[PDB]
Amino acid sequence: LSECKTGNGKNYRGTMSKTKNGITCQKWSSTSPHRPRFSPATHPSEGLEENYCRNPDNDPQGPWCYTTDPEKRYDYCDILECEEECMHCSGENYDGKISKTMSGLECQAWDSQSPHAHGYIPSKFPNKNLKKNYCRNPDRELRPWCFTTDPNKRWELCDIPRCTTPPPSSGPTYQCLKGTGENYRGNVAVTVSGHTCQHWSAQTPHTHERTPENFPCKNLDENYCRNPDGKRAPWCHTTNSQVRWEYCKIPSC
């Protein structure tokens, strides 16, 4: 079933099996390390299968599970809230029904190889929500898109409404380098070889698509080094007409 939830998740039937703190859930049909007050024998219509997170008691805090930690009887799980009316960030979790592209073309179905042959086969990418002919962003495009039914346009981006509420929490950000700097939010604006960063909102001296508009949840503010895509460390386009982009040297945390 659908791996996202709505409201307090009373009807959630996804397969999340870790608590919000990373502890593996205990099976509902198991009595160690804790004795469940909810299990299939007594609550057969609550979906208490395997060790998936559920809300058998209508908890306002949403889905939870008994945990395999003897010291923690149960805990709430971290589950993707469904994005149907609008999308957040660049729509990697968009799960709505819009099926027309920018120019108004009807989307080709993901399970169809006609008129365009492709590799986004739903059963090969089962967790990508490649349903019917709905616009999706399975792997790093600017926003949700689809192959089109027009033989003369292989694919095109779709016009998906952006949610105005706050985005999903993505964990903590740092003013120092941790890992590949995906969580960096400091103010360094110079590269390793000493170049001045070009503002992300500007298209000179270099044209690009890594703009605050396309990537709202990446905080591509002013000309601060950022690692909005999947690079080794933070980087930025430079105001040097001869160096399109370069990595920045951010002090580790």
From Swiss-Prot:
Residues 27-46 are annotated as: Disordered. Disulfide bonds join C4-C82, C25-C65, C53-C77, C86-C163, C89-C217, C107-C146, C135-C158, C176-C253, C197-C236, C225-C248. The record marks R35, R37 as: Interacts with fibrin. Changing R136H: In PLGD; severe type 1 deficiency. Glycans are attached at S169, E209. Residues 4-82, 85-163, 176-253 form the Kringle domain. Transmembrane segments: none annotated. L-lysine binds at R37, D59, R73. This is Angiostatin. The gene is PLG. The chain holds residues 100 to 352 of 810 of the full protein.
